[PDB]
Design a protein around this ligand. Structure first.
Ligand code: HVM
Ligand code: HVM
Lengths: 469, 471
């Protein structure tokens, strides 16, 4: 079972002995520090509040387990047993913490307060930063959701330019990342974050997480279709690739079906197998049930362009109302190898230059989508900005000489709309002056309870692109 | 609760309809594919997966029904192999009819070798082998963390031995700072445990419980830490009182090593004029067991380390060790734990060496670089079907994409062997059966729902030792 007393960085065990004597308040905040990626989608806090922070999180057994572990880990008795016991006894093991946060799905420029944390009992001054470690992990769903939304912006731009509309947008970036993340837990968190922006996923773990922690009106938040893998083609033998293809598209004759076509020779597969031997099985398919040809190797742009050129010579191409070429409706491509935000841009731009509509393609992304991301992409960071010691509040901050980008904010913070409707973070308690209206942060956790929450449907609404609105 | 029926890539739900008819066996393997440097990989983490997710009764009627219900909506179609999952429930009380054979954990194996194989033990469950690809391929993560951590240990060992003449302290020279910087609690425990294969210092507490539960150590714990400050504990004093914070902290922890982040405002002033003058008397009186460890945390990591050492060498008595390298007094050391990854680590120790500073002077912390800034394509960790039985005939299967020979997979039944010169070879096409190469190094570790062979964390560490530590 999870034990919050064992879910912090080791050094934080020792911090209660380091703050100024008679400190009754430690007040901290989270931002995606300013330094590409100008605005971040705030998502994932609610998962952490519910799974890890709410309710009775301290027990006698957890305190004893922690004590025993830390005694050996530090080769010394430095653990605040009394401090944890106080929480157990006074609050029935509910954390005396208040968290205020911007609504989930909100899209906020860099360098703004996203949430704040403070203790609600003077005895628990040390608890605010105990829980930095677990809260800072919100970087991950924030960053996944942000980077996925940034890819959506690219796809929207190019789809609108090449087709005149956004039809199909929220299926154009499919999550392939389940195997390529670091754990089952990560898989669910990251896949949920991608689903803020798109509807297509193979990372099944995302569905249960959303259902449990956020909720949707629809039975599920994301969808998939049948598709082949190398094992299901290659198992037939090298000389029987055509047989595998015929079997699979016949098994799935009335739903869209993706078929990995590069086991031996993508270009032969497209030109000869699909384009000649099995063409009669493709041209007969419903518009609601296309064959989706999947290359999976080689230079992504060059491979997509060559696959399209092949198919456009074997199948009847049309020219849409914008002047771009369009495969027949029973035939599409999915490129799901080497896709990240940079190659995504390269591919759609190269397709546009060769007069191929983005309607012809969808993308899959695995590691690029869910794994090839770090906390330093958006500089997601938690810092103390205010303390009260001997009854006096002081504004506190770091400001390292050699790196002004690491300067932190001072004092009590609030988030506001400017007169032009942008965001601003007021420091030093200046929000109290009421020159910029009401604080946009809401209390979402207090004293062991989640006090405000968002459905997944609301999060999605909040995270929509302008071009969509 | 975890449901293995919902723990696969969605498309794999449809694959039972795609394999050739009359297929009784699907046999697949995992490797860290070679790429025409990370030449060798530490095999670690499978045992976690086997125990946590794969062993015992993993199928129930309720799990079947919930998968069925989710998949109907997710696919907008009924494609789920309810019959096949029910078969396992009724026939094997929900235990997976799968055999997995693996190289022992901690083993260090060159790229492009079989590390483990998976096959179904019941013909009806031909589809189950690749169902569990997704969950098993996540072993990429502990392998990669353990590998990348070991490659960093190789760099540290080289420069420590050069600058000092020995490896003392090596075991503590790369500390895990990564708990906040990973994507989840579960990742934290897995990655931290992988780093501890190579080192003994960690602040990622999650790693300890994982090792205790799934591997085990003769010692009470596998990893250790010391007291240390963060910006909050310094800055909470007010800037004008940074010296008061330092004094308070080193006096609180006067008898153990203590790390004190020193860059809140001006790292150079803190070193030269706070530690180097105002509080010097509290540092020179410390035990060799209980040094002050000054922690910069900003600026160019090499430049900052070199400037910090230059300042400290002017304020504190420096000696020259027997190799000619400068050494701080024993009550004073440095920890650099900003911007550290395998590339910057190398830069910093080389820069130190060029300026005649012993690596004895320094330890490193690494967070995102150690545990998060890694992907499955670093070592090309990959799982592929290499053998099937169809109509009772075994056939060697493989991929070989025309545009990428690096993605060619191995053929047939595989086995891993020592070569006559003591290297490793993977034999393909069942050639291991010829017995020209001594015993297969793959052992059965899972069979029909049971974990059949386990390794302690101690054994894993032994297996993963560096040669230089052997020598
Ligand atoms: N306009 C346009 C253009 C392209 C297509 C379409 C269209 O019909 N759809 C949009 C795409 C949507 C999903 C397709 C997933 C296919 N699945 C795979 O390829 C699975 C691979 C995989 C690989 C590795 C790991 N896990 C899974 C089906 C509907 C429309
Ligand atoms: N030769 C030599 C050279 C350098 C030192 C030493 C020496 O005494 N040791 C080696 C190092 C070992 C551990 C020190 C960790 C200190 N912890 C921190 O700085 C924690 C920071 C942090 C930051 C972010 C997230 N989590 C934690 C103490 C023993 C010997």
């Amino acid at each position: 079972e999870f034990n919050i007393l064992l879910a912090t960085d080791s050094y934080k065990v020792t911090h209660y002995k380091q703050y100024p004597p008679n400190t009754s308040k430690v007040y901290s905040y989270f931002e995606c520090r300013e330094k590409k990626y100008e605005e971040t989608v705030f998502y994932g806090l609610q998962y952490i509040l519910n799974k890890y922070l709410k309710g009775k999180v301290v027990t006698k057994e957890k305190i004893q387990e922690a004590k025993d572990v830390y005694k050996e880990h530090f080769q010394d008795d430095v653990f605040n047993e009394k401090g944890w016991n106080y929480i157990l006894e006074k609050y029935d093991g509910h954390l005396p913490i208040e968290i205020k946060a911007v609504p989930e799905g909100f899209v906020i420029p860099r360098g703004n307060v996203l949430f704040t944390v403070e203790n609600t009992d003077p005895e628990c001054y040390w608890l605010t930063n105990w829980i930095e470690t677990i809260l800072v992990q919100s970087w991950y769903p924030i960053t996944v959701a942000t980077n996925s939304r940034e890819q959506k912006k690219i796809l929207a731009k190019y789809l609108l330019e090449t087709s005149g509309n956004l039809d199909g947008l929220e299926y154009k970036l499919h999550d392939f990342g389940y195997r390529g993340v670091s754990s089952q837990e990560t898989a669910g968190i990251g896949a949920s974050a991608h689903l803020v922006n798109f509807k297509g996923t193979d990372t099944v773990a995302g569905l249960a997480l959303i259902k449990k922690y956020y909720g949707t009106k629809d039975p599920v938040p994301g969808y998939s279709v049948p598709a082949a893998e190398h094992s299901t083609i290659t198992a037939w033998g090298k000389d029987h690739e055509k047989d595998a293809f015929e079997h699979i598209v016949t098994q799935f004759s009335s739903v869209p079906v993706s078929v990995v076509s590069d086991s031996y020779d993508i270009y032969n597969a497209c030109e000869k197998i699909w384009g000649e031997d099995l063409r009669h099985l493709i041209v007969s398919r419903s518009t609601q049930a296309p064959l989706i040809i999947r290359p999976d190797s080689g230079n992504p742009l060059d491979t997509v362009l060559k696959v399209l050129e092949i198919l456009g010579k074997k199948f009847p191409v049309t020219e849409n109302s914008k002047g771009y070429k369009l495969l027949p409706p029973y035939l599409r491509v999915i490129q799901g190898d080497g896709v990240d935000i940079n190659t995504l841009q390269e591919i759609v731009e190269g397709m546009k230059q060769k007069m191929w509509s983005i309607e012809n393609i969808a993308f899959g992304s695995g590691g690029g989508l869910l794994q090839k991301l770090t906390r330093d992409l958006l500089n997601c960071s938690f810092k103390c900005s205010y303390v009260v010691t001997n009854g006096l509040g002081i504004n506190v901050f770091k400001d390292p000489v050699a790196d002004p980008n690491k300067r932190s904010k001072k004092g009590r913070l609030s988030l506001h709309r400017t007169p032009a409707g942008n965001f601003v973070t007021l420091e030093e308690g200046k929000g109290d002056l009421e020159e910029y209206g009401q604080d946009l942060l809401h209390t979402v956790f207090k004293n062991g309870k989640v006090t405000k929450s968002y459905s997944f449907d609301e999060i999605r609404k909040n995270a929509q692109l302008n071009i969509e609105l």
